């Protein structure tokens, strides 16, 4: 997603992208375990991912 | 007003129930987070909106 990047590869953009990695390791990996326990939005969730 | 508190006690009260918690303890106090960006706050699996 070039929103974060292509602004100038400083210490700061990568030092924020590390916390982005830490936040996305929890809510968007092993999505099938979410979708087998999620509500009625089964198919649209997998299509989104 | 940003989300501040006094000790960790009122923080982990406000993370427990975001509806019926204390804004003002005996001498202690905690100011709730109202903002243009209403942030997600994760504390373990307890997570509020």
């Amino acid at each position: 997603d070039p929103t974060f990047t292509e602004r100038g590869f400083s210490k700061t953009v990568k030092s924020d992208l590390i916390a982005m990695f830490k936040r996305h390791l929890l809510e968007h990996s092993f999505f099938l375990d979410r979708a087998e326990n999620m509500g009625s939005g089964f198919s649209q969730y997998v299509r989104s991912r | 007003p940003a989300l501040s508190a006094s000790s960790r006690a009122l923080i982990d009260e406000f993370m427990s129930v975001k509806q019926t918690h204390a804004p003002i303890h005996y001498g202690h106090y905690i100011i709730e987070e109202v903002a243009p960006v209403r942030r997600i706050l994760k504390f373990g699996n307890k997570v509020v909106f």
Binding site: - | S6, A22, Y26, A35, V37
Partner: protein, 49 residues
Amino acid sequence: PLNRRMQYSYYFPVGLFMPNPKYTTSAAIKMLDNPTQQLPVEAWIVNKN
């Protein structure tokens, strides 16, 4: 250029003090000291992580 950056100014106090009729609004937290002569020394705010 539609990826603008707003710059909000948050604020929070630290080290305030209640007036002498001190009350509480949660029947769970009881601190293990004399609660009347209590005043915060600090503030615990939350970050983007």
